[PDB]
């Protein structure tokens, strides 16, 4: 997260850290959506140009964390994965269309002050909240700038940007399964996600029921926090039928 700030303790209790077993390394962010399901980006797990094709056994999930590097005894919980599901039309060769994956935990995690699931939007909430100019929030342990890495979870709030502006900001082909967010050059304020933040949630708080909803997943961008450039996010509601299928069937 570039130009963000330290999260408060328990500010983002649905935040997950994907961690590689060997060599031990932070891989990306993810979000908790129930006691046993985790949502992340596909490219975290499958991106052959970067030698990423992880199986269930290469990874663990660390939940309830604040510190990037410390093991936080009696606060964080670590789970193994039972199964990984990537969207079957995930397009890593071109534009990361449908950059989405689900992970089933081997055993459910206990909720706590530090661990708690985010909501996924219904249609009315998606229509209502996913509008240009409305702000959501992005969290992660990724880079603080273009390359470094933070001591603790970072947070930033960013406005949703209109599709024409998103389209004209890049030569990469955008689809209806993505949205972009970030300040325009004329707005003065700054902030963006960055490398290492992929998979982390873009959340918005509903003024109708006071609940946090995950509208997006950190997917891609060109550089970090550049003027005239925006972060792209997987459009969660657009893929909710796939999410439902996977969960209902498995």
């Amino acid at each position: 997260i570039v130009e963000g700030s330290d999260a408060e303790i328990g500010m983002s209790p649905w935040q997950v850290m994907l961690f590689r077993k060997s060599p031990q390394e932070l891989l990306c962010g993810a979000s908790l959506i129930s006691d046993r399901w985790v949502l992340t980006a596909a490219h975290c797990l499958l991106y052959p140009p970067w030698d990423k094709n992880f199986t269930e056994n290469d990874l663990l999930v660390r939940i309830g964390k604040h510190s990037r590097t410390r093991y936080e005894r009696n606060i964080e919980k670590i789970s193994m994965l039972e199964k990984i599901y990537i969207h079957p039309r995930y397009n890593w060769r071109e534009n990361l269309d449908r950059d989405i994956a689900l992970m089933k935990l081997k055993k459910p995690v206990a909720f706590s002050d530090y661990i708690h699931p985010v909501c996924l939007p219904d249609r009315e909430t998606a229509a209502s909240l996913l509008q240009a100019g409305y702000k959501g929030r992005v969290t992660g342990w990724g880079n603080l700038k273009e390359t470094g890495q933070p001591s603790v979870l970072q947070v930033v709030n960013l406005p949703i940007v209109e599709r024409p502006v998103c389209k004209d900001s890049t030569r990469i082909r955008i689809t209806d399964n993505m949205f972009c967010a970030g300040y325009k050059p004329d707005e003065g304020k700054r902030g963006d996600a960055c490398e290492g933040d992929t998979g982390g949630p873009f959340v918005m708080k509903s003024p109708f029921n006071n609940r946090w909803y995950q509208m997006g997943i950190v997917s891609w961008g060109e550089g970090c926090d550049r003027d005239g450039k925006y972060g792209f996010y997987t459009h969660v509601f657009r893929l909710k039928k796939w999410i439902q299928k996977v969960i209902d069937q498995f």
Binding site: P13, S34, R36, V118, K135, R137, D248
Partner: protein
């Protein structure tokens, strides 16, 4: 409730309410920014 908790597990009913914030009637340091963006 959208998902079946037999396969989804528990937590949907109470989703999106943070123990240290909403549940304690405490506001976090920047969430007013989000709320104010809706007035605009």
């Amino acid at each position: 409730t959208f998902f079946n908790p037999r396969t989804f597990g528990s937590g949907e009913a109470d989703c999106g309410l943070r123990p240290l914030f909403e549940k304690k009637s405490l506001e976090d340091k920047t969430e007013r920014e989000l709320l104010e963006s809706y007035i605009d």
